[PDB]
Design a protein around this ligand. Structure first.
Ligand SMILES: Nc1nc2c(ncn2[C@@H]2O[C@H](COP(=O)(O)OP(=O)(O)OP(=O)(O)O)[C@@H](O)[C@H]2O)c(=O)[nH]1
Ligand SMILES: [Zn+2]
Lengths: 311, 113, 50
């Protein structure tokens, strides 16, 4: 009675909101996902069990499910005000998911909810964990991710040794279909860092706060400072994401005329061999807030550790 | 989470100048950290308005480094005193995580504006 | 020593990669063909472009 069919149209926003519950009523949903934790008593990069979330998938004209979810979760009232303030400071960035703060009663009391709109099913941390902890006995997440983004079809896995690199070298072509998604995620990350610096917000960026479309959320561990003096910490993010940048060949679009995958290739003259400025431009475009000096020529390095870092 | 330095740090004391040996007695709330290998300062605060130099004494005394600073930032503080203004500095080359640490601790333990 | 000199002088300091010297100054070309399908796509006819 009410509740489920009233919470549904309260989570339902003002745009189109053709929603369907993910097998729940007014209660939360439990999933098994990967996180990156550091909270003074636990640390690591493992798969924990999420507990406080209600998810509503979205439909469209022909009443078939689509890759869009409304995640409405429950924490603390102080956290309510803190997240509302930070989002109000950060809402104008085009790389931040659209939040919605409301209050709804489950009993005689009134509890607050925070709803995020139009997320994907999996985050970037899920993809990184799936590719860095491969096990052919159970790889359901990787297969689902591959088939939901038109990298292959469901009958591609009926083959045996479909994952091998020596046998079936076509898996490289299959993997190289996520590079554009990764590149757009990198660009949106740079945009988010610029917005955080301009707004005066201090926080650490993790892989599980970004979905596979590039949008950011979860400002629950941030603080506030004077405008223009913000500082993001992006060590673990880039360091963990680095091995995936070459498997998927994310920088293929940089060999075309206007960084567009539909135009012909760039025609460099055969007599050019320096390319010392292009490397700096690429570093400034994709790794702007990585704070450690980068030497395009390793003859200027200070020791072997710097040589490794720049190579 | 990925919390920004739960266990905090301790202390702020000593000196500063603008041209090498201009550090006379004490012109800095040189802030934080006594690491496990020795005293290694992180943040500098200045009730003054323009400084490029400082000199923190440590251990041997003979070894006290003439630190190169960076262009400052300014803010006003919500102290019980009332109107109080400093000009913030960090030791040059301080990586992002350390500045985040000191800024978070300063903002979350003591009140600022 | 005329084509080599012609491409050396175009360099901005006299240095050029070694991999483009045979590509722009050689007089003879040798092609090794595995099968006929590859042959009809590379050197079909009497003159080809490469
Ligand atoms: N893409 C996606 N991720 C989900 C979904 N449900 C749960 N998650 C994961 O669960 C988390 C829910 O977000 P938050 O709870 O705001 O973020 P958090 O990383 O747990 O941080 P804290 O809230 O501070 O603990 C996300 O970070 C995701 O990694 C979903 O439907 N889609
Ligand atoms: Zn180097």
């Amino acid at each position: 009675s009410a509740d489920a069919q009233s919470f549904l149209n309260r989570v339902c926003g003002v745009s189109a909101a053709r929603l369907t519950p993910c097998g729940t009523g007014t209660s939360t949903d439990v999933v098994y996902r990967a996180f990156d934790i550091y909270n003074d008593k636990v640390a690591g990069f493992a798969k924990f069990l999420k507990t406080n979330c209600c998810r509503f998938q979205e439909k469209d004209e022909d009443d078939n499910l689509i890759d869009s979810y409304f995640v409405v979760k429950r924490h603390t009232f102080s956290n309510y005000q803190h997240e509302e303030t930070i989002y109000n400071l950060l809402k104008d960035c085009p790389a931040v998911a659209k939040h919605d703060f409301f209050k709804f009663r489950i009993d005689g009391d009134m509890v607050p909810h925070i709803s995020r709109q139009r997320l994907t099913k999996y985050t970037m941390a899920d993809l990184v964990y799936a590719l860095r902890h491969f096990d052919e006995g159970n790889c359901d997440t990787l297969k689902e991710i591959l088939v939901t983004y038109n990298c292959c079809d469901d009958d591609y896995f009926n083959k045996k040794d479909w994952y091998d690199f020596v046998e079936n070298p076509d898996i490289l072509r299959v993997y190289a279909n996520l590079g554009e998604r990764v590149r757009q995620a990198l660009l949106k990350t740079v945009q988010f860092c610029d917005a955080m610096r301009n707004a005066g917000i201090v926080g650490v960026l993790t892989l599980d706060n970004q979905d596979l479309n590039g949008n950011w959320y979860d400002f629950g561990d941030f603080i506030q400072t004077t405008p223009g003096s913000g500082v993001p910490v992006v060590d673990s993010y880039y360091s963990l994401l680095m091995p995936i940048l070459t498997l998927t060949r994310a920088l293929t679009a940089e060999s075309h005329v206007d960084t567009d995958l539909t135009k012909p290739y760039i025609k460099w003259d055969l007599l050019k061999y320096d390319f010392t400025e292009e490397r700096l431009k690429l570093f400034d475009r994709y790794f702007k807030y990585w704070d450690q000096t980068y030497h395009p020529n390793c003859v200027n390095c200070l020791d072997d550790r710097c040589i490794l870092h720049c190579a | 989470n990925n919390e920004l330095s739960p266990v905090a740090l301790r202390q702020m004391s000593c000196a500063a100048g603008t041209t090498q040996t201009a550090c006379t007695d004490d012109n800095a709330l040189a802030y934080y950290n006594t690491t496990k290998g020795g005293r290694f300062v992180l943040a500098l605060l200045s009730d003054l308005q323009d400084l490029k130099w400082a000199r923190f004494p440590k251990s041997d005394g003979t070894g006290t480094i003439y630190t190169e600073l960076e262009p400052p930032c300014r803010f006003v503080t919500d102290t019980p005193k009332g109107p109080k203004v400093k000009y913030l500095y960090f030791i040059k080359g301080l990586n992002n995580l350390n500045r985040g640490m000191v800024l978070g601790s300063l903002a979350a333990t003591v009140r600022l504006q | 020593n005329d084509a080599l000199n012609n491409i050396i002088n175009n360099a901005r300091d006299g240095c050029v990669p070694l991999n483009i010297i045979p590509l722009t100054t050689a007089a003879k070309l040798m092609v090794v063909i595995p099968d006929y399908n590859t042959y009809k796509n590379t050197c079909d006819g009497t003159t080809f472009t490469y």
